[PDB]
Design an enzyme around this catalytic site. Sequence first.
Site, PDB file in Angstrom:
ATOM      1  N   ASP A  81      27.832  43.412  29.354  1.00 60.96           N
ATOM      2  CA  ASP A  81      26.412  43.022  29.426  1.00 60.96           C
ATOM      3  C   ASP A  81      26.392  41.505  29.221  1.00 60.96           C
ATOM      4  O   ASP A  81      26.601  41.019  28.110  1.00 60.96           O
ATOM      5  CB  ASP A  81      25.559  43.738  28.393  1.00 60.96           C
ATOM      6  CG  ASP A  81      25.445  45.256  28.469  1.00 60.96           C
ATOM      7  OD1 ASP A  81      26.277  45.937  29.085  1.00 60.96           O
ATOM      8  OD2 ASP A  81      24.441  45.824  27.878  1.00 60.96           O
ATOM      9  N   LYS A 113      18.828  44.283  32.300  1.00 61.94           N
ATOM     10  CA  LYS A 113      18.533  44.581  30.894  1.00 61.94           C
ATOM     11  C   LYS A 113      17.523  43.565  30.376  1.00 61.94           C
ATOM     12  O   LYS A 113      17.594  42.348  30.684  1.00 61.94           O
ATOM     13  CB  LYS A 113      19.839  44.535  30.091  1.00 61.94           C
ATOM     14  CG  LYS A 113      19.735  44.621  28.585  1.00 61.94           C
ATOM     15  CD  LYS A 113      21.090  44.842  27.933  1.00 61.94           C
ATOM     16  CE  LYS A 113      21.088  44.601  26.443  1.00 61.94           C
ATOM     17  NZ  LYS A 113      22.284  45.155  25.760  1.00 61.94           N
ATOM     18  N   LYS A 116      17.688  48.844  31.708  1.00 65.41           N
ATOM     19  CA  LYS A 116      17.938  49.027  30.273  1.00 65.41           C
ATOM     20  C   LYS A 116      16.948  48.196  29.454  1.00 65.41           C
ATOM     21  O   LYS A 116      17.106  46.969  29.330  1.00 65.41           O
ATOM     22  CB  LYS A 116      19.367  48.666  29.919  1.00 65.41           C
ATOM     23  CG  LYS A 116      19.766  48.734  28.465  1.00 65.41           C
ATOM     24  CD  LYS A 116      21.254  48.508  28.222  1.00 65.41           C
ATOM     25  CE  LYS A 116      21.601  48.340  26.781  1.00 65.41           C
ATOM     26  NZ  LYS A 116      23.047  48.082  26.539  1.00 65.41           N
TER      27      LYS A 116
END
Length: 250
Positions: free
Chosen positions: A102, A167, A201
């Site tokens: 990430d 995200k 996310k």
Amino acid sequence: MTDLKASSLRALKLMDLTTLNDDDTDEKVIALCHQAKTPVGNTAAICIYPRFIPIARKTLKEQGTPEIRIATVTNFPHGNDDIDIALAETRAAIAYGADEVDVVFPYRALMAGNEQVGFDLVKACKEACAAANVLLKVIIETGELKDEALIRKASEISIKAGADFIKTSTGKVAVNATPESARIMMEVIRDMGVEKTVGFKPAGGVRTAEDAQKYLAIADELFGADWADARHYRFGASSLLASLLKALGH
């Protein structure tokens, strides 16, 4: 069976159970791994700093849950615009054994008018991850971007550069996931027609079962109730797990 019970079991199985703290230790990560194995099922993943990946892998294997994925973070939390540094950190994450990386998008550079560096940074990290069969999530930091047009643009750039997930947040700034930010980012997935290849996310500030329930409602509205499987949806959260388990009777 209740709508909250159904959403809460679903959410549990989509969690990236996280610990990213200054005082993290091996012991703390081992405990997190044990926490991810619950009486009703396992979280999708854990998310930890790269140096803890090897001990986490060993722990997950010894407790019989090798299918819990290991996510980590790079270019984190600052989202600086040095591509060489972001890439070196991503290569190290892969070498430690990450299943997923990430990376923080260079959001301040976008805010200052530079769209190209975010494309180039994400693309470089995607190329490294794809060669290693590692998924790449891109953290855009919606709470710092703030404006809808910039949230959309960072999402678009990330998707064009190869993000496997977008995200919301690092969890390390004042404002993290919100339902509005989630809707905006999912609308980008919809508008680009990339539902098959890009997940979403929400992360940071998703604390209770009811919170989780708000975010899945939006996904289900936009993409239908089957879309949000583990390849397309995760929760970046910690305390949320205990809330979910309480909602479920456990």
